[PDB]
Write a protein that binds this ligand. Structure first.
Ligand SMILES: [Cl-]
Ligand SMILES: [Cl-]
Ligand SMILES: [Cl-]
Ligand SMILES: [Cl-]
Ligand SMILES: [Cl-]
Ligand SMILES: [Cl-]
Ligand SMILES: [Cl-]
Ligand SMILES: [Cl-]
Ligand SMILES: [Cl-]
Ligand SMILES: [Cl-]
Ligand SMILES: [Cl-]
Ligand SMILES: [Cl-]
Ligand SMILES: [Cl-]
Ligand SMILES: [Cl-]
Ligand SMILES: [Cl-]
Ligand SMILES: [Cl-]
Ligand code: NA
Ligand code: NA
Ligand code: NA
Ligand code: NA
Ligand code: NA
Ligand code: NA
Ligand code: NA
Ligand code: NA
Ligand code: NA
Ligand code: NA
Ligand code: NA
Ligand code: NA
Ligand code: NA
Ligand code: NA
Ligand code: NA
Ligand code: NA
Lengths: 296, 296, 296, 296
């Protein structure tokens, strides 16, 4: 019923300009760039999208622009999650108006909420999504919400939930989820274990580093499907060499900087309090961009 | 230079109406109620104020209303903190325009920031505060940011920082901070250890339960000053009986409900995804309100 | 029924010789030294006693020596806890034979045990203690066992349990325990919050730094009893200056080194893998010993 | 130089009798049973071996018995780790006398040790091992020691270290270790992610559930080598159905109970404070044993 949601989808970055306003022109180029990488969809306004340093009107603006460029070409998932249920509902209804294929919401964070409150939160957003499915988004490292398997089981069986974005390194739990829900769309969230996450039960992934090297992750899926165990390991080895660097420099700004050297983004800035990239990393980030372009 | 910031100050709740909009009339009554409890100041738009389910315009609206009722009567501290530095700066400049005595900012959260990024974040807000001092706000349990003593030492010595709101149960660290900064204004943040936090080095406190029983905390300060060890323990014992209940029912909504039964708030609702109080707790919450009113 | 267990009791260190065997002569001097500090008792074979790098026969040897020097002079508590229930029972029966006033056992650790298994573990040790009361020992930072209030409530109401050694910095929980068990003997375990822990509900303490400056902690009890709030804070301030140093140098070996400079221990070594004190700290540790001796 | 250490090796359980003494006859049958499963080696006296509820003489007794049955047939690794360095050295020298192929030591736990102290601890044990290589054993969930990649890098390059037993679910770190040490023998420690751990870089595994179904894990290695991605996932799916049950009943006692129903162990008891299996699980554990025997 929602198998059209399976696949490999970049967590879209939100380009900003030299004054940290939204860079609309570069955003549109970034969407077309990802489309031309062969991805199955894009995930807009997520953690990687710097959602939580943007206003609601800014996030809606980004959602509508992406729909203009991508609707009917690749799958469109709108991350609508806020701490506030009402704010999340507003973005869900906007995503519906704009033609998105699905919505998604991080577990509301900062304040402790009971599990029933989390459930009611998802139900309300599903209501406002007005018929497009919900992608539950579990990211314990950032949210501080550590859901049990049984809690995950209750969320992904809520009426309206069509998928789970599982940004967790616990691949025992990944397998348990697959075994309990053989048909669930299950995205691996940590790029650095993509190959192992697929083997454990994920049938796709949503990741930030897909914005600069989606073909590698698409290649890992293909290798595992074909039985080329060694090819999958070698691709993941190269992916993690890049992730090691991005972690050193700062992930979001490192990816924006690589995309700038690939002539995709005019300005590679993140919003404060993210600092700019340190000058001493620029040489290696440019070399990475050139390597990746030649790799294609 | 900033000793006028010392004392006992409620973490102001933000009243909402039956549709979860800001209840401006009840907010104004809540400010006057707290003033008439004898508090030294109020802390507006903090964690207890449900800041992170409100928009910037909503938070500014609350700041200005509180300044109208309280400026020149009690000390006014504006919690301006957001994840975004620019958003925090906007609220800092607003707080300055409205006549606040100080600003405050939680450590930016959800995303991991380096310590230098945290420092630069506070510097930027201090700049926008345009001459009123900054109250660094440390709440590891909710922020996920666990600052070391040495990091706290660097923040509270930033030019412009006049105080620390220490919402931590580590009273070794509390004492270390007092010993390193004998003149620092140092607020105990966990009401349930108020008496022990003062003994460890705090010279005041900012707390959510002060909204319904500030005289008890004022009484603890007095007992310790006078040497009545037993009186302080007995007051804290009674404070924690109340905190036990509020934790059972949900703290914010429990306090709003007690204030509703005290004829301060017309509507005791928190914003979703906070649920309403369960009916089975109403009897005990009303009895608590009556007890507290008679206690005065 | 067990009020004779209340008070201030050093966590006895276990002296070793230049080859890391038990130094029996220095152990006997350490017991008499602590007695002559005015302490209410001693706690033998605990965490501070390096119990978990000693064999059962070594621990029994230490228990019997201490009983020889201290029985009938000060209260004698034997820490008998091991991971193994049978091993703990052997030390409990030994402590009974040797004339101890009480036994104690850390929550068994390394392996995860259910709460019922923890309860049954204490019951078995209580049985082998053959009529002397049990001191439950909660030290989450080292054991990895974080007991809830309700679990603590069930343990301290087990038949045979006469006290709780609460080595936790959560002074909300400390107060909750006091309020639930107004007669329970409740030892503050973290010396660096002694004064705040007493105010929160502890009626005594068991601590490692008591071995070199028990009079300070005895002085804090007296100050709080007399209502001298400032004196308690000043004593704790000085205690924590010492704890800061001991943490820098290594706590156990730092205390053994101070005691060596006080002519109590012939050799200040801990067992491997504890390293020896670094030469650069020796000057300050000797100065501390001289300061403490002159302080008396 | 130490490639003879690669492979799939059960974490040997230590059989006990009805009075919880070592069951020597059943131990000898368990060794031969594992040999006849086709394993590459056995890991003796580890966490699964209930090492930390046994004395040194008991552990030496088990080491020597296993060497008698297995030396020259399969690879022999002796887990010699204690908190005490001297105790670990005693077991290392014993393992050398008995003809073991390697020693291993968990990171010393309960007390906090500096990283240099950990390094010196391994060096001392390596010295006492007198020429057989060391298998560093990292199990953060039980030890409370969370080693960084850089710390792991320094340990596995110590002279004498030939392998790493990586009982961690972080398969980013697993890959980082493989990439940094392309020749290191690297055991996956969590059976429930075996297939994903191999894909991430492990070249073998040491696991407790191997004692009852080693052929499955051997089958996963073969599937991945042959490129049968689906077969590996299906075997791991079945392995985790069993692990789910064992976690419900208690892992060690569940495995001992399955082995009892397989006529390998005469008595399936663990030492207190491990409780016995609850009667309500016996039916399912016997059915599992029969299933596994028929599976062969
Ligand atoms: Cl374009
Ligand atoms: Cl538009
Ligand atoms: Cl929850
Ligand atoms: Cl539900
Ligand atoms: Cl009014
Ligand atoms: Cl207004
Ligand atoms: Cl930080
Ligand atoms: Cl700085
Ligand atoms: Cl003497
Ligand atoms: Cl003797
Ligand atoms: Cl437990
Ligand atoms: Cl019980
Ligand atoms: Cl046999
Ligand atoms: Cl033998
Ligand atoms: Cl460490
Ligand atoms: Cl080293
Ligand atoms: Na940008
Ligand atoms: Na698609
Ligand atoms: Na989450
Ligand atoms: Na991913
Ligand atoms: Na309200
Ligand atoms: Na004031
Ligand atoms: Na914080
Ligand atoms: Na407070
Ligand atoms: Na010594
Ligand atoms: Na006594
Ligand atoms: Na404990
Ligand atoms: Na203490
Ligand atoms: Na057994
Ligand atoms: Na072998
Ligand atoms: Na470890
Ligand atoms: Na394994």
């Amino acid at each position: 019923m929602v198998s059209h949601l399976r696949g490999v989808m970049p967590a879209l970055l939100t380009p900003f300009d030299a004054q940290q306003n939204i860079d609309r022109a570069s955003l549109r180029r970034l969407v077309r760039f990802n489309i031309e990488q062969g991805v199955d969809g894009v995930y807009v306004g997520g953690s990687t999208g710097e959602a939580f340093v943007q206003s609601l009107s800014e996030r809606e603006e980004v959602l509508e622009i992406v729909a203009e460029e991508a609707k009917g070409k690749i799958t469109l998932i709108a991350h609508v999650g806020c701490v506030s249920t009402a704010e999340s509902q507003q973005l869900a209804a906007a995503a519906k108006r704009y033609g998105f294929d699905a919505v998604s919401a991080v577990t509301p964070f900062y304040y402790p909420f009971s599990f029933e409150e989390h459930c009611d939160h998802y139900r309300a957003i599903i209501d406002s999504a007005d018929g497009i499915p919900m992608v539950v988004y579990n990211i314990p490292a950032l949210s501080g919400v550590k859901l049990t398997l049984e809690q995950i089981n209750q969320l992904v069986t809520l009426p309206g939930v069509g998928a789970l974005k599982q940004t967790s390194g616990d691949l025992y739990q990944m397998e348990q989820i697959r075994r309990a829900h053989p048909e669930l769309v299950l995205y691996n969230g940590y790029d650095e274990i993509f190959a192992s996450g697929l083997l454990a039960g994920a049938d796709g992934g949503i990741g930030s580093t897909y914005n600069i090297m989606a073909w590698r992750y698409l290649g890992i899926v293909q290798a595992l499907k074909e039985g080329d165990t060694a090819k999958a390991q070698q691709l993941q080895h190269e992916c993690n060499k890049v992730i090691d660097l991005l972690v050193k420099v700062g992930v979001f700004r490192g990816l924006k900087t690589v995309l700038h050297y690939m002539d995709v983004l005019s300005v590679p800035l993140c919003r404060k309090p993210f600092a700019p990239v340190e000058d001493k990393f620029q040489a290696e980030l440019k070399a990475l961009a050139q390597q990746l372009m030649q790799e294609r």
